[PDB]
Design a binder for this molecule. Structure first.
Ligand SMILES: [Ca+2]
Ligand SMILES: [Ca+2]
Ligand SMILES: [Ca+2]
Ligand SMILES: [Ca+2]
Ligand code: NI
Ligand code: NI
Length: 358
């Protein structure tokens, strides 16, 4: 049987002078074996859920800091950089933001003058959310996901409530507000998934380039990297990183996981013991090529964060159940559900450098 994660060489050490290695965490994972693995292998953290808008301010003026603070305290004690997920997002956002002072839904307003009043009220609420969070955590966060998933998969901007009420101004104001209270030293990111898809990559590039030309402070791009064993291509990943580097932007890989399945994750395995060894080998081959690319582009990438620690906790389990009538698991990491190393661990810890020509 493979050794446990706490018995093998550190991932973060292996990528010194290349990029930090991070994990998404819940506060209840900051003890026992999961905390031991974090300290041994990772030098950067992000809150999986405790810092989302609905977690921090579920009602106006009701602040829920405890879980977020525990993650900050862990990052302080163990010398881990900390990313912030996330200041502004169309998911996991409390409904009160988009309700006017009469209890009406701003998105349904038809009077042009009340629409403008709603836009200013919503922006003030967004500004106050950002101000309060950034003032609390400024000296503990080194990468802010200021806005998340603002590009539509079908082209153009996502027509969320934020966009419906404020246009693109919520994006401009969010970055300006984060800069104002974070100071010039704060590093401000726009985060998204499928950034490797050329059409979406290009929409994100055009948005950021236009905003930079207006003086909006944007320092980098977060690539969620919710990927598969056979998709997206290394070539498309490379092109995406380089396109944002061409604007003077940092790149971070922010939510890396490699599903066993395609999309949708139909036909998922219902137990880890049913996963064929050849599939874990294919995952290992792909992770090898992926981290070889990251090494190639290490000047362009400051950190690579996995959206979890080991296979026993991943949002991909819930996704598998969604498309398989409530049953199914996924195994996206280099540490398996019992914290034992997987073939992918060996393939991204090693110093292999013989290339894979065909
Ligand atoms: Ca079975
Ligand atoms: Ca780097
Ligand atoms: Ca799992
Ligand atoms: Ca390797
Ligand atoms: Ni670092
Ligand atoms: Ni290789």
């Amino acid at each position: 049987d493979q050794p446990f994660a706490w018995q093998v060489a550190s991932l973060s050490e292996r990528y010194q002078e290349q990029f930090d290695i991070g994990a998404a965490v819940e506060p209840y994972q900051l003890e026992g074996r999961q905390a031991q693995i974090l300290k041994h292998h990772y030098n950067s953290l992000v809150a999986e859920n405790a810092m989302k808008p609905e977690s921090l301010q579920p009602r106006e003026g009701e602040w829920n800091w405890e879980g977020a603070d525990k993650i900050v305290e862990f990052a302080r004690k163990h010398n881990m950089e900390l990313r912030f997920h996330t200041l502004v997002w169309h998911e996991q956002v409390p409904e009160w933001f988009f309700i006017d002072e009469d209890g009406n839904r701003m998105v349904d307003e038809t009077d042009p003058d009340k629409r403008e009043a709603n836009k200013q009220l919503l922006l003030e609420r967004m500004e106050n959310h950002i101000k309060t969070v950034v003032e609390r955590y400024k000296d503990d966060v080194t990468s802010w996901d200021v806005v998340n998933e603002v590009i539509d998969d079908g082209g153009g901007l996502r027509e969320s409530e934020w966009y419906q009420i404020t246009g693109t101004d919520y994006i401009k104001v969010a970055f300006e507000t984060a800069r104002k209270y974070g100071g010039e030293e704060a590093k401000l990111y726009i985060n998204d998934y499928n950034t490797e898809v050329p059409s979406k990559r290009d929409d994100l590039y055009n948005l950021v380039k236009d905003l930079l030309e207006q003086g909006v402070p944007i320092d980098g791009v977060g690539h969620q990297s919710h990927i598969q064993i056979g998709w997206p291509s290394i070539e498309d990943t490379r092109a995406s990183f380089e396109k944002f580097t061409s604007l003077g932007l940092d790149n971070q890989v922010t939510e890396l996981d490699m599903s066993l399945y395609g999309w949708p994750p139909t036909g998922a395995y219902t137990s880890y013991d049913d996963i064929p060894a050849e599939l874990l080998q294919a995952q290992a081959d792909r992770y090898d090529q992926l981290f070889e690319l990251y090494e190639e582009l290490a000047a362009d990438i400051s950190s690579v964060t996995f959206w979890g620690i080991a296979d026993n906790h991943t949002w991909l389990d819930g996704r598998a159940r969604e498309y398989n009538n409530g049953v199914g698991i996924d195994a996206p990491f280099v540490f398996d559900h019992n914290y034992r190393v997987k073939p992918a661990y060996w393939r991204i810890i090693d110093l292999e450098h013989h290339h894979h020509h065909h």
